[PDB]
Ligand SMILES: CO[C@@H]1O[C@H](CO)[C@H](O)[C@H](OC(=O)c2ccc(C)cc2)[C@@H]1OC(=O)c1cccc([N+](=O)[O-])c1
Ligand SMILES: [Cl-]
């Protein structure tokens with residue numbers, strides 16, 4: 001595998017046309033996954049599948065500025081399953097991050113942090129076996 005939590009440096013930050021691909025398998029009895037796109041201590045984009053929030057499955061997205069979480073954005077479409085292999089693709093577009101799972105569009109998240117070239121690391125964490133994490137310019 002890779003060791004989770006896993007840091008993927010994003011050299012010179014993110015830019016439109018940058019595609020991040022994450023391959024892994026969800027652990028049995030998973031509780032959470034998190035992708036954290038970081039600008040130093042700030043989290044520009046937190047993508048957080050929650051397998052059992054009051055017996056519901058929900059993806060929580062948010063931004064952390066100066067250690068404070070903002071307004072959450074919630075999605076009820078939940079393509080992940082305990083025990084099963086997934087592919088997450090995060091495409092940086094001008095106005096938003098665009099997320100697909102298993103080749104199907106899931107959600108978009110408007111840029112709240114504006115200094116895209118300072119979003120210099122991706123943290124991958126949670127209840128997964130992480131196979132690979134990479135980027136390409138499309
Ligand atoms: C108000 O709740 C917070 O919401 C944030 C997003 O708006 C983050 O998701 C926080 O979590 C972390 O930053 C965080 C969590 C764990 C670690 C190890 C590191 C960082 C925290 O999550 C929970 O409260 C929460 C409540 C119930 C369930 C879950 N979950 O992820 O399943 C999260
Ligand atoms: Cl590793």
Ligand SMILES: [Cl-]
Nearest residue numbers: 112113114115
């Ligand atoms: Cl900013």
